[PDB]
């Protein structure tokens, strides 16, 4: 029943010194060796310290660890915070033939201004039509803030049935991206004269329209 208690969210500006703790509940923190792992998202974790005070060959000297055995807490001191230091931190233990990991620490970035919400509309394909399906796809990209409201329209009537939209996600150029999908029947696609998707972003509205051609 031995678990390592770790702060879930720790934030610090670059260039300063921060301390990450790892507290054991039942067993003392000096009983077994504690290993800290720094893992980038979408990659394998990498060992950054070992034996509670020894830095492996490759990591910078700033990854310094200290043991406060009186409080049963393992400490990892980080000095000179930089951009690539933003990663998941986990502390390891062993207990008694049962390796126990830590809760996890995420270092935040503490950065983009308002961006124009480019909108693209795609009519249902001919290949989708013989499959007895139809889909209207609305595209929202290169925008900020990441809060856009979508509203489909059938000529003039708003459409809510079959509407599926995506939460905004950050792009590579620090902007956001989103999508909206409108499931429809082939008969309903040709029943209305035209369809349109309206995107509201910071008051401004960007509207495109599609027609069965």
């Amino acid at each position: 029943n031995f678990m390592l208690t770790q702060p879930h969210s720790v934030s610090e500006s670059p260039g300063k010194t921060v301390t990450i703790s790892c507290t054991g509940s039942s067993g003392s923190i000096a009983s077994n060796y504690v290993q800290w792992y720094q893992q980038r998202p979408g990659s394998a974790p990498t060992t950054v310290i070992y034996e509670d005070n020894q830095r492996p060959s490759g990591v910078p000297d700033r990854f310094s660890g200290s043991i406060d055995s009186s409080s049963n807490s393992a400490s990892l001191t980080i000095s000179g915070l930089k951009t690539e230091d933003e990663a998941d931190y986990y502390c390891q233990s062993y207990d008694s033939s049962n390796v126990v990991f830590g809760g996890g620490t995420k270092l935040t970035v503490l950065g983009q201004p308002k961006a124009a919400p480019s909108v693209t509309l795609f009519p249902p394909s001919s290949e989708e039509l013989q499959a007895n399906k139809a889909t209207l796809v609305c595209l929202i990209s290169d925008f900020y803030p990441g809060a856009v409201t979508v509203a489909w329209k059938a000529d003039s009537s708003p459409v809510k049935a079959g509407v599926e939209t995506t939460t905004p996600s950050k792009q590579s150029n620090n902007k956001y991206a989103a999508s909206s999908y409108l499931s429809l029947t082939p008969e309903q696609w040709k029943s209305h004269r035209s369809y349109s998707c309206q995107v509201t972003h910071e008051g401004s509205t960007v509207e495109k329209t599609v027609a069965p051609t």
């Binding site: 394998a44 060992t47 390891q92 009519p123 290949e127 989708e128 595209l139 999508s179 999908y181």
Partner: protein, 224 residues
């Protein structure tokens, strides 16, 4: 040096048997007197220790995962495999095969993490539809084109443009749950409108769970 590579299918149905094998190149399983260990990590959660093995029959397992982890070592093939029983939807985690220098020490080398998804009901392949650009699809000197992935099960699906040759402007959106079980997403790329009728754009949608690879060409819309 030494490298550890995982294999096996990326899917397993609930209440079934998992079979993932981790292979070793550049080293020997029996030599050196070290250990092997399997460690999993759910998306957005911390690392979880599954079990550790020796090149002999010595095994130890997590008491939360006891009586469900079966790991074996075959020295002839220079690899080792883990078998999991009674897998549920809460077992969706990225599985890491890490070499362990010291039993209570650190995992010096970590293999790349394969993604494992568990979800009830049968696996459903994707339906890829072309997304034809047109005059309404361009805003200025640039246009947009893409492909639609609809009614597939389960995550994930990867979309590559021109077999990965086109990466600039490619936006792969996260999936959303449809009104009836299945997922839906799209992957689009921004292109200047001058090369619309002179360049061929083919999207490569792969569904490893359903073992379906679909190549769909993207062409400008023709009025009918």
């Amino acid at each position: 040096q030494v490298q550890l590579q995982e294999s096996g299918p990326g899917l397993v149905k609930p209440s079934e048997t998992l079979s993932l094998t981790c292979t070793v190149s550049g080293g020997s399983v029996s030599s050196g007197g070290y250990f092997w260990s399997w460690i999993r990590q759910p998306p957005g959660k911390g690392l979880e220790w599954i079990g550790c093995i020796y090149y002999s029959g010595s095994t130890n397992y997590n008491p939360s995962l006891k009586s469900r982890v079966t790991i074996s070592v075959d020295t002839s093939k220079d690899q080792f495999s883990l078998k999991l029983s009674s897998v549920t939807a809460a077992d969706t985690a990225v599985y890491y095969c890490a070499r362990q220098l010291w039993l209570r020490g650190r995992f010096d080398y970590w293999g790349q993490g394969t993604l494992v998804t568990v979800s009830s009901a049968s696996t459903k392949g994707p339906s890829v539809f072309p997304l034809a650009p047109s005059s309404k699809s361009t805003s200025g000197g640039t246009a947009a084109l893409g492909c639609l992935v609809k009614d597939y099960f389960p995550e994930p699906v990867t979309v590559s443009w021109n077999s990965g040759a086109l990466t600039s402007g490619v936006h792969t959106f996260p999936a959303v749950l449809q009104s009836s079980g299945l997922y839906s997403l799209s992957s689009v790329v921004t292109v200047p409108s001058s090369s619309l009728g002179t360049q061929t754009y083919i999207c490569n949608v792969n569904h490893k769970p359903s073992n379906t690879k679909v190549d769909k060409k993207v062409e400008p819309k023709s009025c009918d």
